[PDB]
């Protein structure tokens, strides 16, 4: 009786939200950006190839200096690269080799990683002893660690396969806030530029916008037909793009609270693993299962170019803070740095 | 390059030297994925042979590393990509429980037909055979109630039952095994094979059965690259 009545009210609320989004869907992003000229053909060359990983690379993250990057592979090795020279700055042996994510702290003093061991391990890069040591192991998730991102040297946000995200106090080792509401494994998260909000994509084909300080879900974004694997905020923080296993990328707007554009092609039938934006946000770069990285025009939904330099799955990618280059990691155990030429 | 850059580049080459040494140790060790249900008893086999539970048992100076991804739920379509290059999958079922056999058959079919497990052989264990023998000997419950095709099943002439085994026990035991093998032969095209076995909760020969099965998996790998198969 009471349960049946309540679940009927949820359907009424869902229709109210759907009607509200349809009311403000006066135009389409495609119609708005029809007049502007296309970006043309985007040609990028492999400037660097980072060799040394002996297994599938699962994650990479640029440092804020746009020169150092950290990559994670399932050979149980965290490697920090000097991308300008391809020099290896550090090689961190992982206690558990089943790593799924890695993060570089914005200060550059710490890196984080974690995988099927359900632990987010914090590594101190600046020690008087001259070696990288584990500073914290964040326990509390009951599923695998899928993504992690530093807010500062003391705070980090993790998404897990136990359907929850958590905000951690690194110094005390306790999760101050737990973000619940996903009905599937959360596969990715992206931080807003001001680090006051973050979006997460799960295997329930939905993306939720979370308030870091308040600790609740502000908005829920649906429209994908399969698990969401990747998510990335737009550079101004008012939008984000997702990538799913249904071979599509979608651009959702926070303030309009709805999808704005779909990035799919008839030839593309493979899942998407990673998404990122260029510094101006005009380009959306997506990694695919078909060994390629497709550069999309974010405004016009046109495939601007292709990064074809890997012989296995493109598992991860990232664009530098200065926008100078894009790194692609792959299951072929290589990292490649791309940019164009005049 | 400056003096400090040459020193930095030398440090990088010393890092590469240690990375190569670590990659040589990983080639000698065989990785196994231990899958099964709660009632399967997969925790018993590993204990006798001895987040993520990792076990290392050595047979004839050969190192086996077995992993059990405990917890979570039946939604394992995500982390199964990690074990795309394991030597074998050790799938354990409970033959005594006829009620949940169809779930095991459905579970085994998903693993066999998984996109990321198209080249991984499966070392199938049908655990708790002593319990199954007692259950068949008691005769209180009949397999034909759950599987109608068991009434029209006859033991193949090629079967070689162990001495001291009741023919009724053999007929039921070989019917459960054929259900899993029928799934394996449906697809695969010879890329991966299933190695069914019958074990018990007190069996001490489980480590060698994996050893003999992993030898066939490695041997098939070597013959393919020599173009001998």
């Amino acid at each position, epitope marked *: 009786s009471e349960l049946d009545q309540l679940r009927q009210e949820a359907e009424q609320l869902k229709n109210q939200i759907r009607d509200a989004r349809k009311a403000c869907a006066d135009a389409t992003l495609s119609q708005i950006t029809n007049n502007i000229d296309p970006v043309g053909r985007i040609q990028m060359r492999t400037r660097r190839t980072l060799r040394g990983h002996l297994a599938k690379i699962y994650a990479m993250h640029w440092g804020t200096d746009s020169r150092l990057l950290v990559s994670a592979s399932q050979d149980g090795k965290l490697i920090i690269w000097d991308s300008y020279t391809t020099n290896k*700055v550090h090689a961190i042996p992982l206690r558990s080799s089943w790593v799924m994510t890695c993060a570089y702290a914005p200060s550059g003093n710490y890196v984080a990683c974690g995988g099927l061991d359900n632990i987010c391990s914090i590594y101190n890069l600046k020690t008087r*002893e*001259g070696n990288v040591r584990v500073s914290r192991e964040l326990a509390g998730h009951t599923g695998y660690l899928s993504c992690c991102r530093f807010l500062d040297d003391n705070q980090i946000v993790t998404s897990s396969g136990d359907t929850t995200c958590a905000l951690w106090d690194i110094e005390t080792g306790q999760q101050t806030t737990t973000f619940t509401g996903h009905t599937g494994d959360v596969m990715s998260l992206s931080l807003a530029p001001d680090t006051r909000l973050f979006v997460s994509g799960a295997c329930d084909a939905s993306a939720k916008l979370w308030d870091v300080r308040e600790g609740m879900c502000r908005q829920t974004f649906t429209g994908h037909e399969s698990d969401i694997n990747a998510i990335c905020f737009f550079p101004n923080g008012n939008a984000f793009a997702t990538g799913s296993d249904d071979a599509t990328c979608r651009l959702f707007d926070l303030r309009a609270d709805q999808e704005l554009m779909t990035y799919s092609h008839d030839n593309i039938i493979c899942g998407i693993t990673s998404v990122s934006f260029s510094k101006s946000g005009r380009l959306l770069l997506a990694g695919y299962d078909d060994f390629n990285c497709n550069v999309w025009d974010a405004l016009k939904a046109d495939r601007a170019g292709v990064l074809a330099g890997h012989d296995n799955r493109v598992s991860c990618l990232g664009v530098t803070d200065d926008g100078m280059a894009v790194a692609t990691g792959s299951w072929d155990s290589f990292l490649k740095i791309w940019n164009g030429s005049s | 390059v400056s003096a400090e850059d040459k*020193a930095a580049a030398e440090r990088s080459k*010393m890092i590469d030297k240690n990375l190569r040494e670590d990659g040589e140790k990983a080639r000698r060790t065989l990785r196994l994925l231990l899958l099964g249900a709660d009632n399967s008893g997969k925790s018993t086999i590993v204990k006798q042979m001895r987040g993520i539970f990792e076990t290392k048992f050595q047979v004839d100076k050969v190192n086996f590393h077995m992993f059990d991804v405990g917890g979570q739920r039946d939604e394992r379509r995500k982390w199964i990509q990690c074990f795309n290059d394991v030597t074998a999958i050790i799938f354990v079922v409970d033959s005594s429980d006829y009620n949940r056999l169809q779930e095991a058959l459905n579970d085994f079919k998903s693993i066999w037909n998984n996109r990321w497990l198209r080249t991984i052989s499966v070392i199938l264990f049908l655990n708790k055979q002593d319990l199954l023998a007692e259950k068949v000997l008691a005769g209180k419950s009949k397999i034909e109630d759950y599987f109608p095709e068991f009434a029209r099943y006859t033991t193949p002439e090629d079967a070689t039952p162990e001495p001291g085994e009741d023919p009724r026990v053999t007929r039921a035991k070989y019917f459960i095994r054929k259900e899993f093998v029928d799934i394996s032969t449906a697809s695969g095209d010879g890329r991966h094979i299933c190695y069914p076995h019958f074990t018990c909760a007190v069996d001490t020969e489980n480590a060698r059965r994996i050893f003999n099965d992993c030898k066939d998996i490695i041997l098939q790998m070597n013959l393919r690259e020599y173009n001998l198969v």
Partner: single-chain antibody
Amino acid sequence: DVQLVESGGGLVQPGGSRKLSCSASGFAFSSFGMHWVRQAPEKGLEWVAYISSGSGTIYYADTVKGRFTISRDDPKNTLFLQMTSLRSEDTAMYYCVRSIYYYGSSPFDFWGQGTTLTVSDIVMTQATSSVPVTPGESVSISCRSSKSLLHSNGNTYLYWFLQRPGQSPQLLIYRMSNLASGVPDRFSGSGSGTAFTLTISRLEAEDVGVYYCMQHLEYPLTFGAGTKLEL
């Protein structure tokens, strides 16, 4: 804590041989390159030798090349300096210096206490030998180089050290602008090309000492004469 203890020094006859040892504790010794730096009595610092991490690269100063041999024992965390045919020019305090080299590292960050031995090229110039100072007042120290220390990679390989009376040198500024760990923010390094300045805002009693500028653009590493601060 990080420690570097030198031993084996003492009075030796001319033409003799002596073995200096540097025991390291509290840090990953095998990860650090090591230098020997000596300082003649009432004189400035002079770099002697260098052995890299992994013992693959070894450099010597010309005044000691062929007579000194530098070696390390990574399992025992001991640094050695075998000296032969010792001359009266070798009478100095020999310092054991650790230095690690990667992008953003701080070489020459820790020095040993030193051991005293008594026997019976880019030019770095510090023309101002001494500077009278008063507490709380800003002081600037100038250093000059015959060659430009700015490399094509953007680094300017200039280092600043402070040797308080009775103490081993301590790193203040590495690569001409970066502030070493544990150094107050009042120290600031500014330079361009061949001219460099070390600015000390709000000078204190602890800042009193001799300041050395060292170049790390190429070997042999050379030090300036040194500028002394007195109250």
